[PDB]
Design a binder for these strands. Structure first.
Ligand SMILES: Nc1nc2c(ncn2[C@@H]2O[C@H](COP(=O)(O)OP(=O)(O)OP(=O)(O)O)[C@@H](O)[C@H]2O)c(=O)[nH]1
Ligand SMILES: [Mg+2]
Ligand SMILES: [Mg+2]
Lengths: 51, 285, 65, 63, 188
RNA sequence: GGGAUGGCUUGUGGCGGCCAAGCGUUCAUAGCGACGUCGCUUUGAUCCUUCGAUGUCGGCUCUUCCUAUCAUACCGAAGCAGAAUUCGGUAAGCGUUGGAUUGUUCACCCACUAAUAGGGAACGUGAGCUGGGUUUAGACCGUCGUGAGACAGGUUA
RNA sequence: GUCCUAAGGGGGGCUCAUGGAGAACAGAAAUCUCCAGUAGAACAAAAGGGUAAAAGUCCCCUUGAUUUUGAUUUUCAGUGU
RNA sequence: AGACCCUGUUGAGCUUGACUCUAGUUUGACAUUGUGAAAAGA
RNA sequence: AUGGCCAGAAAGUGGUGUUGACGCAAUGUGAUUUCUGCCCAGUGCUCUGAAUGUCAAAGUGAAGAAAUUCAACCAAGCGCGGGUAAACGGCGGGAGUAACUAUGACUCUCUGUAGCCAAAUGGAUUA
């Protein structure tokens, strides 16, 4: 068991569902589906914006 | 493993519940006779699909040190090894090496008779297709020793050699070749290895009449030195793992023929003899 | 989506139970939770099992489970 | 608070979730024909099956 | 009526017959009725009583078997259904060993459901008695089955001939120390 | 210490497809589309499938208003022979009742009758009399809690 | 501090490092041609035998960024499709 | 200026392996505490 | 009884106590009749049974010029190892074995129109 696994077993933290951990989210400002991480991810938002 | 191909290779080499078919490495020592090389070639031809071949001379004496054998097994993912050798004391020797977790599980020496040896090419018959596993016959009283001995280990090693790939189904057209090993309890007994092709004829009944014709190779062996397994390593190697498709049986829980989960209940015997009925006024005389 | 179901005999009522106001599907072999541990109430009269399904290519509407 | 209720495009919406072969159907039909009632057994979990393709049809007089 | 609903709509729920008030019938007749009912559903014989019960351990064992079969869930719930005045609350009290549900000879004593914790994983749900509506059932049949309170019926003398048909004559004579009547009016 | 949706509503379902007078367009022939129509939702049967109270209603006693008319008056139509009716129109002048059932959404049954119509003036918070939602303090029973106690609840004053 | 229809997968074609001999500028070192080249390059690992009509390198197609089902395995589930 | 609902740097009663303490109880040591023996160690 | 249960700030203090187990004190239940679902052993209750495993103050030893530091030793309790009011609690049974003791683990399979038996009665449907 890793440190996280032992901690999660002690604290009763459940594993996330496969739908919950999907790399997809709806951006309402653009009205578009985008990746949270990875290539053109949401964690790098604005790094290629003009202003 | 940054590369996906190397990750695939690592996952193929990883331990599994249902194991891969074993791979055999064919290699020779610094001195190895032409008869021994021909015998190794015949065994490789019988086991082409799951074998690798070494072509150099290896300064290895397996019963003294097997560190190089363990290194070769770890490098090539080969759990069976056939080692060829020759000497003045041992003129033609095939050392069958079986390994567990890239360490030597057991080893057995076969001494080949040069005068009676015939290769596969010395018989003018149609040979076995590449990758076709044959049927097997072990004959004689030497394979039922109550204590594990050289002939018991030889039977186990030859089963692991000619085992092939397991399958739940076989075509009836794939039963055309049989490998027969004969050895009798006793100056040393002779372990004889023969291969036959199978022909079927009409006999007037449902079952056909089998006939055999020699395929090759012709081999006479005398069992030599032995390296026995450690008991703990043997227990680890003889442990059997259960597949996920093998259901663990629960008490009173089963599956019907339509796939419904069914539970069984047990009422018990009805014993109303200890019940006193109500002594009613209309029944009191 | 949810309405508060009030419990208790006092003038101030407990309010942890939530009733689903929309139709629901509960699936096969459904048995309701005991009332002491039933937070979400999916009422029986709002449970559905069939739907009128239209095939766009065939232009056919069938009632399907 | 009013959430954004959007369904993403996905190839999984246009596939078959559950399939069954004719051999499996024939086995289930034979089991349906041969099944009997036992008072001392209980049903714990129903098998999700296309029961319209497995159940025997109605009588011809009724039809 | 309820058996048909259970078979059609909830086949995953387990139906168990409980023959109560077996101390009011001969034991051979109770065994014969058990053999008849066990062709359809598992049947338990029971005298429901806090002090002197019969069949309590057997019914407890059957409920334990059901709990083990449903050990994945937190508990099993056992709902008691039947006609009025057959002994549902009495069976709950007999299983508990303590008077936890109200029991009366008055039909319709239990009016709402009641949860009772029998063990940590076993619940018992008391229910009011039900009379499935049938067009062949007469008020005399319902009254003799025990559906209604006899204090609130008009002309109770009209149901005495049905009781006289149902009860053997020597049983009535021994019950009331009375003999020689030719009809129900003279008997009354 | 503060505090206590509304010119709304009414009689005719939703989803999918088709047609469609027309609107547009006629360097694109698309896009809207009333009226309709088509598909999903027992030979007068069965009676062995009643599907969850957070939201509360009551009764007297008495007056008035609306009409969205149950009866009475008049009228139009119908195989309306007669009799008894059915559908519709004008009409609120005049009436529209005892009674049973609290194991209970008190709503339905029975009868008399010409008929036993529907609403508002409270319920878009709310001092006439008095029962249910209903609930200060006494008390048991059930469920939960180690407990003080709380409640899925049920009962009594 | 920049750039990319992402990586991956399948198929197909091709052969690398280097040396010799040649070709205006071009001269040890720019590009082209032939010959010789067991990999002495590249890519993975840490061979004591990794890979050459490929595991290298360029094209074509997919790029949908973590599918569906399971009465089965292990763990969990007071929100047990 | 009731009752109900809402708010508190809220007050107070009550409960419990909530925190910090504590009566009681229990255990050890020093003092009160003296006079002779026998044995084992310094 | 050099005791239990209480009280007092303390006392050469008081009570129970002019008391002594057919008594005193603390609990739970609540006349009679009925009545103790079956079996354990997880929490708890109690065993001075071996340990120093945890181990305060005092005391003992080593170093240092000393302040001081470092070491063993170390009561009760806890812990470890035993028997239970088996109270709470858990608990579908019955056979087996290869384990051999706890926990086992791996197979099998379970469905009298008013009687009989009990010291008249078979009851709580209690006057
Ligand atoms: N002799 C005898 N009487 C019984 C038995 N079981 C129940 N009774 C009696 O039957 C009457 C009915 O008891 P209940 O527990 O109220 O039965 P119920 O079906 O729940 O009645 P409702 O609550 O009205 O629906 C009680 O007066 C009991 O005394 C029995 O086993 N033997
Ligand atoms: Mg009852
Ligand atoms: Mg009753």
């Amino acid at each position: 068991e890793t440190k996280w696994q032992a901690f999660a077993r002690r604290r009763g933290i459940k594993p996330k569902t496969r739908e919950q951990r999907r790399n997809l989210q709806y951006n309402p400002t653009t009205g578009q589906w985008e990746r949270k991480w990875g290539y053109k991810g949401a964690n790098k938002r604005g790094e290629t914006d003009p202003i | 493993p940054r590369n996906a191909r190397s990750k695939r290779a690592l996952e193929k080499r990883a331990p599994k519940i249902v194991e891969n078919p074993k791979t055999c490495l064919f290699l020779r020592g610094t001195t190895c006779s032409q008869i021994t090389q021909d015998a190794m070639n015949d065994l490789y031809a019988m086991r082409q699909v799951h074998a690798k071949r070494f072509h150099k001379k290896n300064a290895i004496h397996p019963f003294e040190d097997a560190t190089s054998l363990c290194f070769f097994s770890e490098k090539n993912d080969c759990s069976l090894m056939v080692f060829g050798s020759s000497n003045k004391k041992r003129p033609h020797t095939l050392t069958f090496v079986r390994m567990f977790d890239y360490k030597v599980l057991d080893m057995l020496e076969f001494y080949l008779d040069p005068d009676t040896y015939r290769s596969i090419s010395q018989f003018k018959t149609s040979k076995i297709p590449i990758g076709m596993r044959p049927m097997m016959v072990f004959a004689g009283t030497a394979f039922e020793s109550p204590v594990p001995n050289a002939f018991t280990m030889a039977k186990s090693m030859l089963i692991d050699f000619f085992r092939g790939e397991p399958s739940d189904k076989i075509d009836v057209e794939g039963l055309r070749f049989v490998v027969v090993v004969t050895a009798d309890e006793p100056q040393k007994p002779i372990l004889r290895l023969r291969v036959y092709g199978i022909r079927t004829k009409r006999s007037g009944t449902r079952l056909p009449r089998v006939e055999v014709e020699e395929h090759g190779p012709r081999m006479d062996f005398r069992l030599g030195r032995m390296r026995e397994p450690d008991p703990a390593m043997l227990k680890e190697a003889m442990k059997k793992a259960k597949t996920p498709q093998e259901e663990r049986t629960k008490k009173n829980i089963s599956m019907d023929l339509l796939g419904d989960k069914i539970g069984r209940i047990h009422m018990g015997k009805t014993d109303l003899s200890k019940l006193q009925t109500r002594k009613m006024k209309g029944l009191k005389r | 989506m949810f309405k508060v179901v009030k419990t208790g005999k006092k003038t101030h009522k407990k309010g942890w139970k939530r009733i689903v106001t929309k139709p629901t599907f509960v699936g096969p072999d459904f048995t309701r939770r005991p009332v002491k541990y039933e937070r979400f109430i999916r009422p029986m009269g709002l449970r559905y099992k069939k739907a009128n399904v239209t095939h766009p290519t065939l232009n056919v509407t069938v009632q399907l489970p | 608070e009013v959430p954004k209720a959007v369904i993403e495009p996905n190839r999984k919406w246009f596939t078959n979730t559950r399939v069954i072969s004719q051999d499996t159907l024939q086995s289930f039909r034979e089991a349906m024909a041969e099944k009997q009632k036992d008072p001392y057994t209980v049903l714990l979990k129903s098998n999700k099956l296309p029961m319209s393709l497995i159940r025997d049809g109605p009588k011809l007089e009724d039809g | 009526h309820v058996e048909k609903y259970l078979a059609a709509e909830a086949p995953h729920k387990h139906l168990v017959f409980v023959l109560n008030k077996i101390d009011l019938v001969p034991s051979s007749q109770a065994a014969a009725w058990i053999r008849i009912l066990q062709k359809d559903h598992p049947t338990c014989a029971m005298r429901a009583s806090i002090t002197n019960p019969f069949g309590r351990g057997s019914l407890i064992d059957l409920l334990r078997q059901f709990s083990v079969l449903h050990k994945d869930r937190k508990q099993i719930s056992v709902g008691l259904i039947g006609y009025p005045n057959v002994g549902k609350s009495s069976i709950i009290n007999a299983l508990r060993g303590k008077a936890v549900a109200k029991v009366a000879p008055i039909p319709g004593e239990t009016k709402v459901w009641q949860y009772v914790t029998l063990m940590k994983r076993i619940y018992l749900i008391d229910c009011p008695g039900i009379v499935p509506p049938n067009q062949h059932d007469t008020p005399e049949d319902l009254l003799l089955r025990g559906v209604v309170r006899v204090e609130n019926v008009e002309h109770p003398e009209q149901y005495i001939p049905a009781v006289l048909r149902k009860v053997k004559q020597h049983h009535m004579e021994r019950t009331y120390e009375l003999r020689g009547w030719k009809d129900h009016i003279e008997f009354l």
